């Protein structure tokens, strides 16, 4: 496949079907979809199940259980790394169990990277609808090329060439950072590693959507966005 879509899933039974469906109906259909379920409850697994009949889906379920295991690593980062090691696509993109892809998302992102060989990481705009009908609508824009993506660009808004993962692993020893000190902002930490070598190029269109309507006590102290943004400003790549 041209594209490997890596989705992480953990106990969001009321949302995961809409997420998975949004990927499976894309107008660009030449992808493999990894569904990396982190040993979810029965209800979640029962919602996911019918989608496994789609021949593009690559379903992997962890054996993880209990607070020690759930807090030893940033779990979604661990599952993404496992899927990266199995991916066959030239382009890599990420999805979650409560985020929806707009219908031409893969088409538009594949076209941008196909047309601009000099761009290695692209990002689109994203929209979040707050429900209470809609009480509020937020948009995270994609207006400029940026060497400082952490906490400005979401997990679900990017696509990058597979070759980006090589540089990152060479410097840092892994792709995403499994350290549990980056549990809350794992996407920012991976973008932080990418920003050591590449800027993020914008695609100014809203191509992903979010709807908002003992574990915590065992994680270590969470590192924050300001720390990541200040280290990239100090690194001065742009
Ligand atoms: O034990 C867990 C908890 C969460 N996640 C996944 O990590 C991703 C990001 O997490 P979450 O949605 O909880 O965070 P937020 O949207 O608040 O950044 C999602 O795809 C979850 O399915 C996971 O694999 N294992
Ligand atoms: Mg969420
Ligand atoms: Mg987040």
């Amino acid at each position: 496949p041209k594209v490997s879509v890596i989705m992480t899933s953990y106990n969001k039974s009321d949302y995961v079907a809409k997420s998975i469906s949004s990927i499976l109906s894309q107008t660009f259909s030449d992808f493999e979809l990894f569904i990396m379920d982190d040993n979810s409850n029965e209800e979640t697994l029962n919602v996911i199940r019918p989608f496994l009949n789609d021949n593009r889906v690559r379903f992997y379920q962890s054996d993880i259980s209990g607070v020690k295991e759930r807090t030893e690593k940033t779990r979604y980062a661990a599952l993404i790394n496992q899927a990266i090691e199995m991916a066959e696509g030239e382009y890599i993109t990420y999805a979650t169990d409560d985020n929806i892809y707009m219908p031409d998302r893969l088409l538009k992102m594949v076209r941008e990277l196909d047309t601009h060989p000099e761009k290695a990481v692209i990002y689109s705009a994203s929209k979040t609808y707050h429900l209470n009908d809609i009480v509020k609508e937020t948009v995270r824009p994609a207006a400029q090329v940026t060497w400082n993506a952490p906490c400005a660009i979401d997990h679900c808004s990017v696509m990058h060439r597979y070759s980006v993962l090589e540089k990152v692993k060479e410097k840092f020893g892994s792709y995403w950072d499994e350290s549990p000190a980056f549990y809350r902002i794992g996407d920012a930490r991976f973008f932080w590693r990418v920003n050591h070598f590449y800027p993020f190029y914008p695609l100014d269109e809203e191509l992903d959507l979010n709807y908002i309507t003992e574990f915590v006590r065992n994680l270590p102290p969470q590192r924050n966005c300001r720390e990541l943004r200040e280290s990239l400003k100090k690194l001065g790549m742009g």
Side-chain angles (χ1 to χ4, degrees):
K2 180 72 173 188
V3 174
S4 299
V5 182
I6 300 178
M7 172 190 283
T8 37
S9 158
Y10 183 61
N11 281 353
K12 296 204 184 83
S13 56
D14 286 321
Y15 288 83
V16 69
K18 178 83 185 147
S19 284
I20 296 165
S21 271
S22 80
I23 302 166
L24 298 184
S25 63
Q26 292 287 120
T27 50
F28 182 86
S29 56
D30 184 23
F31 63 82
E32 55 187 359
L33 170 62
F34 290 95
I35 299 181
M36 310 294 295
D37 182 80
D38 211 17
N39 209 19
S40 303
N41 62 207
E42 190 149 301
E43 188 172 355
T44 300
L45 302 185
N46 311 330
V47 172
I48 294 176
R49 180 180 322 286
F51 295 104
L52 315 190
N53 291 290
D54 182 305
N55 69 55
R56 299 171 295 180
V57 167
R58 297 182 69 178
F59 180 72
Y60 293 90
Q61 187 176 333
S62 81
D63 216 42
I64 294 289
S65 176
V67 61
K68 162 163 107 155
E69 285 192 351
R70 291 265 170 222
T71 60
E72 191 82 27
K73 299 163 185 173
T74 287
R75 289 295 317 152
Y76 57 94
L79 296 177
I80 288 157
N81 285 339
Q82 289 170 223
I84 287 156
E85 186 154 273
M86 289 180 292
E88 293 176 16
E90 175 184 3
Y91 302 157
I92 302 309
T93 192
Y94 312 96
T96 62
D97 48 5
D98 58 1
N99 172 276
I100 301 307
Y101 277 15
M102 296 289 294
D104 290 325
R105 182 179 188 278
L106 297 183
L107 184 56
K108 283 175 165 176
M109 291 183 159
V110 160
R111 275 169 166 180
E112 183 62 16
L113 282 167
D114 278 352
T115 301
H116 293 279
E118 76 281 8
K119 290 167 185 197
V121 184
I122 55 171
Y123 75 104
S124 78
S126 181
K127 188 143 55 69
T128 295
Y129 287 105
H130 299 72
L131 311 172
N132 147 168
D133 296 281
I134 292 143
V135 349
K136 206 174 65 132
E137 283 174 24
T138 301
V139 168
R140 308 193 151 270
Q144 63 191 68
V145 177
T146 182
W147 282 92
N148 211 146
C151 314
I153 302 165
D154 192 62
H155 189 126
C156 299
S157 311
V158 309
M159 179 177 286
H160 55 80
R161 307 180 180 283
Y162 183 95
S163 70
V164 168
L165 299 169
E166 277 86 300
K167 284 265 200 282
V168 171
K169 178 160 176 34
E170 164 172 69
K171 181 140 162 61
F172 301 97
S174 60
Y175 305 111
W176 284 55
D177 190 340
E178 297 180 11
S179 160
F182 284 104
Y183 168 82
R184 338 273 305 157
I185 61 165
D187 44 352
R189 180 63 157 180
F190 169 65
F191 299 164
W192 181 85
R193 297 182 160 180
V194 175
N195 267 161
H196 280 61
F197 314 105
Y198 308 86
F200 283 46
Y201 287 89
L203 189 180
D204 191 7
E205 272 178 78
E206 298 175 7
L207 293 180
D208 72 274
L209 138 54
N210 314 279
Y211 283 98
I212 47 191
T213 174
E214 41 156 33
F215 178 71
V216 174
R217 76 190 178 197
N218 281 282
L219 298 163
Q222 297 299 298
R223 285 166 73 184
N224 62 41
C225 294
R226 292 234 208 151
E227 176 188 332
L228 302 176
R229 297 185 62 76
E230 288 296 341
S231 57
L232 295 181
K233 309 181 181 185
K234 151 76 198 316
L235 183 67
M237 302 296 301

